[PDB]
Symmetry: C2
Subunit: 333 residues, 2 copies
């Protein structure tokens, strides 16, 4: 029965309240911090894209097509459909001998307002390349092509790619990922509900290598380093996931998920983080991931300060007037 | 007292996300017909109570002096998309008070509606104060001031005669105490007074019924509610919940959204007022919750009930158009 994790104030008062759950786990699976119910299956949605990109790396497809940090970042991305994202994804497909028509994710306008205005002014309609999951889906197609697997139907539950992804995520998290746990994601691929505890543990393991074979440990290390090295390619302009990974370069891994999921790691402390705003609000998940991270940087005041700017964000109206704050509650203390 | 789960968002076989909330349904006499959760704790009505804020426009006689039909009264009660028709009409309402866009103190922003925003972006460098979802309410405020020879400059300020009047009107409609402690600044820079959901609902029941109101306030309230139901495009716009909900049973259902997951409603013919809040402020929950609450009163009107249940239980389709799960008001709305 989940505690209030974020308050949203106006004048002297709380106007809105979010409840959520948080799991912080080390490489060995030891629990360092928890809020609310970390045992009920939650859909990680986009928060677990890095786990899904392991096939791209472990298959040798990354090395074969000359993917560096930018390409791997995109594979792990919910991007804004900025031209830089669109041209990188086209490039990943091109090097595999494919193009946009291979994408099975469908098209949508940026979920960033500033980026949508630019799209609206430069395009008649978005393409599948503008889909926030185009880099992941381009990873998928590249993984298939490299291995001589026809990418057609790569979204299918019993396509060999999704078979491999399910086995990989079972191994990382120790969760049972089958029909019971399964739903269709925004891009038409499977997403697998699992306890927050197991999702945090999966991330701790990618972060530490603990419990993984060398190949999976190495491929996990490359994916995380790539996201922290090219955080723009994970999200883009004005995005929480990009800015959070610019506070302490190379030290903090974060990834947003649809419906208020966040995953994080701090490799150097060997911890994985997962959390869920019960109502699925993004603003709550952002404030909660910042408050949770800040616990581990209390001794580093400029990093703590930067994190607290997301844990306690001012809101201004259309005239620029401060009206209240979105703030993580004292349960983070 | 903890708020019950009012809305579930499903994916595959599971609940993906849950919203908690509160609902009050009150008649003209203040009798409670239906409630969920805490309807006693102060909540900010935000734009949900624009119809009450429009009383000075009508009761001053400003609406009649400036030739306002149902469209102008609807816009005055509106959180509109900033479509061409809303922008022109706001501009007309100001023009009749001897004013223009510079008179507006609400500031500018791009459309609440994505499709309208794409249109705005393609045809404008930046939006003006006229494009602001509250520009009709603000044009009304300025017109009420100009008609009475009150200087509209600083019309947003707490002790400006308009704001003093709005507090007095809203205390009379709601029976709520609206002072400094309850006050916040709204998205449009005017005051917004947190009050119990029960008091908000009662205020709408009284506008809906005339019960407890002096003849002039009773008449002015009937005019505002009628205009909103007569011209629901002007209350919101293309694609909008508020417009579509008032096109289900033309002239019979009043609704209005508020920022942070508020809805207010009335069904004048059943003598009832409705208020509600998604505790987490989610629009999608408040929409599901107002549709389920309205549906309770139309169960034997199968076309209307079905049309309302299309908002209370709604399929989610992904970018490829595949059904992935539902946004559904829970069963506490049937019990
Ligand atoms: Cl996105
Ligand atoms: Cl392994
Ligand atoms: Cl650093
Ligand atoms: Cl003008
Ligand atoms: Cl009265
Ligand atoms: Zn996706
Ligand atoms: Zn307003």
């Amino acid at each position: 029965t989940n505690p209030v994790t974020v308050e949203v104030t106006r004048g002297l008062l709380v106007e809105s309240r979010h409840r959520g759950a948080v799991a912080v786990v080390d490489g060995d699976g030891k629990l360092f911090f928890s809020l609310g119910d970390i045992d009920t299956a939650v859909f990680p949605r986009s928060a677990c894209k890095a786990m899904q990109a392991l096939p791209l790396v472990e298959s040798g497809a990354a090395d074969a097509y000359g993917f560096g940090d930018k390409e791997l970042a995109l594979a792990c991305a919910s991007h804004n459909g900025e031209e830089e994202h669109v041209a990188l994804a086209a490039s990943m497909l091109s090097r595999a001998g494919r193009n946009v028509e291979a994408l099975e994710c469908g098209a949508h306008w940026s979920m960033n307002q500033k980026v949508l205005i630019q799209q609206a002014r430069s395009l008649d309609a978005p393409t599948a390349l503008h889909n926030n999951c185009s880099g992941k889906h381009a990873g998928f197609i590249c993984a298939c092509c490299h291995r001589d697997i026809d990418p057609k139907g790569y979204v299918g539950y019993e396509h060999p790619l999704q078979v491999e992804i399910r086995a990989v995520m079972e191994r990382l998290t120790g969760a049972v990922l089958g029909a019971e746990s399964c739903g269709t994601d925004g891009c038409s691929i499977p997403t697998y509900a699992m306890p927050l505890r197991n999702l945090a543990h999966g991330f701790a393991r990618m972060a530490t290598g603990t419990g993984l074979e060398p190949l999976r440990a190495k491929a996990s290390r490359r994916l995380i380093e790539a996201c922290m090295a090219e955080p723009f390619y994970v999200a883009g302009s004005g995005r929480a996931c990009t800015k959070l990974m610019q506070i302490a370069p190379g030290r903090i891994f974060v990834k947003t998920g649809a419906e208020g999921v966040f995953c994080a790691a701090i490799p150097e402390k060997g911890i994985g983080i997962s959390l869920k705003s019960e109502d699925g609000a993004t603003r709550a998940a952002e404030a909660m991931v910042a408050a949770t991270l800040a616990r581990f940087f209390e001794t580093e005041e400029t990093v703590h300060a930067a994190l607290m700017a997301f844990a306690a964000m001012p809101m201004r109206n259309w005239n620029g007037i401060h009206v209240g704050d979105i703030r993580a509650t004292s349960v983070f203390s």
